[PDB]
Amino acid sequence: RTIASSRLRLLEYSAFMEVQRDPDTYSKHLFVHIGQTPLEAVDVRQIYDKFPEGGLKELYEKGPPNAFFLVKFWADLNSTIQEGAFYGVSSQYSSADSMTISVSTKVCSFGKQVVEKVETEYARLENGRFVYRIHRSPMCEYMINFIHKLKHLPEKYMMNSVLENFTILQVVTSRDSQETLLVIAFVFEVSTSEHGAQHHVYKLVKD
Amino acid sequence: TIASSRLRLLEYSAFMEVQRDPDTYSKHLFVHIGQDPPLEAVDVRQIYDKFPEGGLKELYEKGPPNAFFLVKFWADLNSTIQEGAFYGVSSQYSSADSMTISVSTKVCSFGKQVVEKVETEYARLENGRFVYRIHRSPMCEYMINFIHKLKHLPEKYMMNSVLENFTILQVVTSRDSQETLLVIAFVFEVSTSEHGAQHHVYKLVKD
Amino acid sequence: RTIASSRLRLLEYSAFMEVQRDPDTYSKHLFVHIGQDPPLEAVDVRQIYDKFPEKKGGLKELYEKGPPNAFFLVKFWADLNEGPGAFYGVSSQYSSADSMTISVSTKVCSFGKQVVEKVETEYARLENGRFVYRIHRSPMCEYMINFIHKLKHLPEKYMMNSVLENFTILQVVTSRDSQETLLVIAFVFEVSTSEHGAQHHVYKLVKD
Amino acid sequence: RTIASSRLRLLEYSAFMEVQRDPDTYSKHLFVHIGQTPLEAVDVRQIYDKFPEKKGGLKELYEKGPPNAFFLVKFWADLNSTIQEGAFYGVSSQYSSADSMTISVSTKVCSFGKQVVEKVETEYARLENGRFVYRIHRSPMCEYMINFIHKLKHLPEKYMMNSVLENFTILQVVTSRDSQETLLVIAFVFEVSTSEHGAQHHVYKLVK
Ligand SMILES: CNC(=O)c1cnc(OCCO)c(F)c1-c1c(Cl)c(F)cc2c1C[C@](c1ccccc1)([C@@H]1CCCN1)O2
Ligand SMILES: CNC(=O)c1cnc(OCCO)c(F)c1-c1c(Cl)c(F)cc2c1C[C@](c1ccccc1)([C@@H]1CCCN1)O2
Ligand SMILES: CNC(=O)c1cnc(OCCO)c(F)c1-c1c(Cl)c(F)cc2c1C[C@](c1ccccc1)([C@@H]1CCCN1)O2
Ligand SMILES: CNC(=O)c1cnc(OCCO)c(F)c1-c1c(Cl)c(F)cc2c1C[C@](c1ccccc1)([C@@H]1CCCN1)O2
Ligand SMILES: *C(=O)CCCCCCCCCCCCC
Ligand SMILES: *C(=O)CCCCCCCCCCCCC
């Protein structure tokens, strides 16, 4: 399903690990992935307790409400590649207007922000639209260590228990006006399916 | 003062701006390095304990040694303007060569990276040299809240005590090659002088 | 309202004075400001010709050369409500879809005569898929600073408006190498008497 | 002789008219020319009466300094009608500095010590052989100057041109655009050339 406010569209979002064993051998494992192409609503009060309290509530009140989405991820943490490994995030956005955007990714543990990454991006005019590409943004050591700790657990239900109190809040703003363009609240479980990583998108509402 | 063999820092300023009325604006500078006398050297091992294990030591070992500097700031946190206030950072760099730079600003508390902001800038030919201007980059909420918390302390010595374990590491790289162009370690105290904000620059060396 | 020809868009225009209160505190006063599209009212260019008598490089001559889409009239109600060391400046920004080197000529006319001309050349910068031209903090010439001071010393705002009837500014932006007219703005002035401060009104210049 | 302060050097200065009678015919007449190559001193108080006084004047600029930036140029302009005048009247000049900076060249034209017209041109440097060079190429003269040259040329005798020129002066002030620091100041005074060798000039260092 499509994640788009009236000002910005999320085209793609992937978090992955890449291994280049040698100059001729390359492997990539996707942890989570929202690829390029009806939404169910979720009351934002149902998730407030798990997010910062410039928190999710203040951001929602500031608006616009059409910019708010919840994504449930079932992350693939299976050791499918022999891990020099690179851990990264790639994402792509588009707008109708020519503007610089700022993508804030806040990582929270028990509702409290522990690390934050802020990336500004300039648009490329492409096919009449303005496209923003954040390509292979390295994951911070906190996240790489967190993934390694999860993978050392012997049971997927233990990974789910740890993940119950782990959340990510992505806030995209227009750099110069500081207007909220898109807000995505990410929640996680580990995937147990043969099809791998899965996701479900919901529109965040209030009343 | 601050220049490696590949990149020169022309200006750096952090400030708050208030709109008093539709035609009147006030600006308060917290810190400012404006636009050559010799620099005193500081052994980089004297500051590693506050910048421990992309860290300062790892970057310094990778080199070049001429790219590393330490700036001590005495920040002006006096309420000189009645604060909708904008908190921002403006900076300018220059080089003899045309390249795309990536500016990473890492905010650390007790030696741990809590926020990282990354901004990419494209060279502009100006007066026979290449200039990079990052104008009015908004401060993240973590920094605005940190400034507000410091200002609520009743004594300036308490602010200095909190600031003992707060550091900022700015790393400028050539975007495509990832070569280190300039690294600045920033450390802070609150200014108690009538002259306002002050700074002192040192060259980082390893005896 | 938006000032844009088919080749160049005016994003911002501000004239201001800046004062340093202490080493870390600066105050800025805007005299006039056009900040960052609703439709524009049209004004026949013959209704303003009598106030721009200057012939060579003047309004009528440029309008006749064209293109008509490049011509605008801005009415300003300037806010004239310091110490030594005050900075008087002008900041402006433009954008285009194409990469150009532009030349910005600002002609100041007083009592029907061109008294000052300031010329600035600007090189396109690729930003967000468009080309931006920024003329940041261009210092006002002493003639303009002294003119502002003389207006402020007048005891009545109607005397300021009478002196201002004879004062016009013509801004002509051209493509540097071809000398093609990209944008022409005729600026006319009054002093603001409102509590809201500086005001402006944009009109498109037409002929019949 | 060399016109250079510790921050800026004047390489060349020429005022001229060009006539392109047809696609194959070109003519150029130089009115004045300082081409690329000790100085006699003149006390700046000897010329104060002929230049702008009080605010932004020669005296105020001289007192602000640096004293090494101030020069007086006497010109004997060639006003002979040597070409059949569509003609273009222009000024071309070049400067150089050791530093990378944007300069602003103000040319004030004065009659009886009062500024009548001013042209301000900003220029960006080009890095050339380890020097930053500024070129103002074929800057069009304003109509005031073209009409003044035509009026002088209408006088039947050269002494009559010298009489009118007695109270005509040009003050060129070059500043660093962003800091407004004075880089170079040249006071120009004029007579008409009566020699077969044409246009002449003499450079003096202004002292106090
Ligand atoms: C306090 N409110 C909530 O816990 C909550 C309320 N309503 C939701 O959605 C409604 C639309 O269905 C949520 F998603 C969450 C939520 C939130 Cl806020 C969270 F931070 C983590 C988290 C969940 C659910 C869960 C998960 C399930 C599937 C995939 C990913 C995570 C579950 C929790 C048990 C183990 N796993 O982990
Ligand atoms: C353990 N080593 C250090 O602490 C250190 C060593 N040598 C330096 O420089 C050498 C040139 O002399 C430093 F700067 C620092 C340092 C560092 Cl690493 C830091 F993280 C914060 C910090 C300081 C100094 C200080 C400050 C004083 C004035 C202005 C700004 C900051 C002082 C600390 C007490 C309260 N304030 O805050
Ligand atoms: C001969 N034609 C004109 O005078 C004219 C005609 N039509 C206009 O607009 C049509 C859309 O409205 C104009 F603007 C002007 C004009 C022009 Cl050309 C000018 F050089 C100055 C000037 C004015 C009007 C004025 C002013 C008012 C408000 C703000 C600024 C200036 C008025 C004049 C009395 C005091 N103030 O000063
Ligand atoms: C009041 N002080 C002066 O008049 C003065 C004093 N001392 C000078 O020089 C010292 C080094 O000799 C001057 F140059 C000038 C001066 C100045 Cl300020 C001026 F505005 C015009 C002007 C002159 C001289 C003159 C001229 C002669 C030759 C060439 C160009 C001009 C002469 C005057 C009669 C006709 N022509 O026209
Ligand atoms: C540090 O700066 C981290 C930047 C944000 C990384 C987001 C990647 C999260 C998706 C991976 C899913 C792993 C299961 C928790
Ligand atoms: C209008 O903007 C004029 C700009 C300055 C023109 C300077 C040329 C003066 C030299 C010509 C000598 C003619 C004798 C008076």
Residue numbers in the entry:
A (entry chain B): 218 to 254, 262 to 277, 280 to 309, 312 to 435
B (entry chain D): 219 to 253, 260 to 277, 280 to 309, 312 to 435
C (entry chain C): 218 to 253, 260 to 304, 309 to 435
D (entry chain A): 218 to 254, 262 to 309, 312 to 434
From the paper:
The four highly conserved paralogs of the TEA/ATSS domain transcription factor (TEAD1–TEAD4) are the most distal effectors of the Hippo signaling pathway that regulate cell growth, tissue homeostasis and embryonic development. TEAD transcriptional activity is dependent on protein–protein interactions (PPIs) with cofactors, of which yes-associated protein (YAP) and its paralog transcriptional coactivator with PDZ-binding motif (WWTR1/TAZ) are the two most important coactivators, and vestigial-like family member 4 (VGLL4) is a prominent co-repressor. The YAP–TEAD protein–protein interaction mediates YAP oncogenic functions downstream of the Hippo pathway. The YAP/TAZ–TEAD complex has recently become a druggable oncology target, with the first inhibitors being a variety of allosteric binders of the TEAD lipid pocket (LP), whose binding prevents post-translational autopalmitoylation of a conserved internal cysteine that is essential for TEAD maturation and function.
